[PDB]
Amino acid sequence: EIPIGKPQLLGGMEIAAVYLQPIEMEPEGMMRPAKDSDVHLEADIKAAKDNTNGFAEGDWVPYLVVSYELTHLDNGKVQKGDFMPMVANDGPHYGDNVKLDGPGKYKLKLFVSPPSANQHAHFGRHVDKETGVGPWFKPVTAEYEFVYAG
Amino acid sequence: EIPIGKPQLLGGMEIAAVYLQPIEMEPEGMMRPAKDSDVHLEADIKAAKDNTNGFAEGDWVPYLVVSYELTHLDNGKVQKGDFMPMVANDGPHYGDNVKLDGPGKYKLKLFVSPPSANQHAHFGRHVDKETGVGPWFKPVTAEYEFVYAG
Ligand SMILES: [Cu+2]
Ligand SMILES: [Cu+2]
């Protein structure tokens, strides 16, 4: 794995980015095939100390809505995608197999939003006095930059 | 909180059940309202030692499909539903607000399926040699008998 940029403290969480070789995933048809990709991009999102959404320090934060924008700074080529939650041998991540635009410098923007809290919600929030937690974090954007060699 | 039955090691996880006061949740409408309920049933599902699906011992296992049948053994009345994932000040869990059927003996049967069965929120599994994990556990069931005071 090659770390990207620096881990950033945002929304009560530590948000880091990494990339490695393209991976293979079940269900297969829900990610770009490894054969057609250059890297697997991963967002590492863990709860920071004193998290106000019920998570202890170091916990993976599940059910987030995570997207990305990748720019080849050399020529300005922009590409956008979504991350999918998935589990690997080192635990759960948000990831996507990505085809890049050759070597050069890249800017990575991560759009991290909280779980849906309307009629489409997957993930709930206790709000009683004894066991309730604070409101979902406001959506954040984390910026990175790296040089791709391969 | 009142523990019910006994914790059970199944599918590489430890599955325990409690109930407590009906809890108020946001969004409003993703679960039976608290004042229309008698208890909040909760499944406590954590990875066991040497989990084969990539989760470290003691971690919460997210994106599971947890459904239930709750029988009032005293008269055979059955009620059914799904547990939904949610977070409280002591972490995430699966649960449901339920209206009971008076005092007496109850049997809660949990049906637990892996995240590959999750319609609501897709969740992937690495399957390459380098970063992959073993196949998802086959669906398990677990029962918890308890006496409700009323
Ligand atoms: Cu991944
Ligand atoms: Cu709960």
Question: Measured between alpha carbons, how far is B22 from A54 in angstroms, rounded to an integer?
Answer: 18
Q: Centre a 10 Å sphere on the Cβ of residue A80 and count the other Cβ atoms it contains.
A: 11
Cα distance between residue B137 and residue B17, in whole Å: 20
The residue in chain B having the minimum alpha-carbon distance to the alpha carbon of residue A130 is B89
Provide the CATH number for the domain around residue A52.
2.60.40.2480
**How far is the C-alpha of B36 from the C-alpha of A2, rounded, in Å?**
52
**Two tokens, residue A99:** 């085809």
Which candidate in A26, A64, A93 is best for mutational testing of the B interface (most B CBs within 10 A)?
A: A26
Number of domains into which chain B is organized = 1
Phi-psi bin for A35: left (phi > 0), alpha (psi -120 to 50), beta?
Answer: alpha
Is residue B107 a contact partner of residue B73, using CB atoms and an 8 Å limit? yes
Is the CB of A63 less than 8 angstroms away from the CB of B84? Answer: no
- Name the closest ligand to CA A92: 1
Rama region for A93: left / alpha / beta (φ>0; ψ in -120 to 50; rest):
beta
**Closest to A108 in 3D by CA, of A5, A2, A3, A1:** A5
User: Which experimental technique did the depositors report for determining this structure?
Assistant: X-ray
- HEC string of chain B equals CEEEEEEEEECCEEEEEEEECCCCEECCCCCCCHHHCCEEEEEEEEECCCCCCCCCCCCECCCCEEEEEEEECCCCEEEEEEEEEEEECCEEEEEEEECCCCCEEEEEEEEEECHHHCCCCCCEEECCCCCCCCCCCCCEEEEEEEEECC
Nearest by CB to B123, which of A60, A86, A121?
A: A86
Q: What's the domain range around B124? A: 2-148
B96 neighbors B79 (Cβ within 8 angstroms): no
CA distance A125 to A136: 9
Strands, E, within chain A: which ranges? Answer: 2-10, 13-20, 25-26, 39-47, 65-72, 77-82, 84-88, 91-98, 104-113, 124-126, 140-148
Å from CA of B99 to ligand 2 middle: 15
CA distances from A71 to A82, A100, A144 (A): 15, 9, 11
